[PDB]
């Protein structure tokens with residue numbers, strides 16, 4: 001794929017590659033001049049030539065045709081697909097050019113968090129966008145900062161020699177949601193494993209079945225990461241992850257522990273976890289009850305953390321819906337009408 005995504009390459013006799021936007025296991029997204037839309041810059045996702053990502057790209061195209069025609073103005077902030085084509089056996093999906101990922105913005109600023117005013121506007125828009133999927137019988141299943149993008153390059157950046165990086169300052173925080181390659185319809189077959197480790201709901205880890213609510217969990221994990229500049233689930237291990245959940249959120253409901261087939265993780269009705277091992281004291285140091293992550297006691301910080309706690313409810317049957325999230329007091333500030 002190296003061989004077909006260089007600067008100056010022309011795709012479908014119109015898209016001149018100018019830059020790389022993002023890469024991953026799916027393939028590459030490249031910025032192109034479209035010489036047949038008056039020189040408009042667009043994004044083109046060149047999908048890896050592997051059955052998994054070919055199948056995923058066919059699924060994404062069908063999802064985007066549905067969401068795009070259901071919501072032609074993009075009121076619910078899903079990325080607009082322009083068309084798709086084939087380039088040397090690769091599916092290429094053309095989209096409207098968006099800005100930076102929320103992931104790159106935080107990361108390149110040295111893992112410095114978004115301002116609370118920005119998080120409020122971003123959480124609302126993320127909740128509206130994904131609630132739109134929920135209304136149309138879809139679960140995204142892979143919500144993470146990489147897949148939430150600023151609509152625009154609406155920031156300033158200045159080289160700071162003291163820390164030897166550019167710092168970016170957000171002017172406007174408007175986002176869209178990308179990557180519908182995993183999105184699953186209610187009636188379709190449900191993968192066992194879904195989501196990126198740090199963003200995975202407990203009902204996924206425990207293979208108890210999943211729906212819309214696994215998206216709500218992922219959004220909760222996104223919002224705390226936006227507030228802190230890093231994840232509270234920094235792990236590469238499901239058992240460790242569950243141990244971190246116990247220390248941050250309190251103990252798992254017995255019913256979920258007793259029902260799961262993933263019994264390697266447990267012993268009788270507790271996590272099979274050596275608290276007193278090296279690794280166990282490590283997790284205890286990295287972990288404290290959620291509300292202790294709060295950077296202020298100020299009521300608008302309390303309002304965010306109450307929404308985060310409801311999104312990170314263990315029982316997906318009890319977990320807040322995005323319909324209800326959109327009505328949470330944290331968003332009252334956006335509906336100020338004197």
Ligand SMILES: CCN1/C(=C/C(C)=O)Sc2ccc(OC)cc21
Nearest residue numbers: 022029043095097098099178179
């Ligand atoms: C690379 C992020 N990205 C996507 C990623 C996936 C997995 O789909 S889709 C997309 C569309 C526009 C864009 O503009 C900047 C970026 C963009």
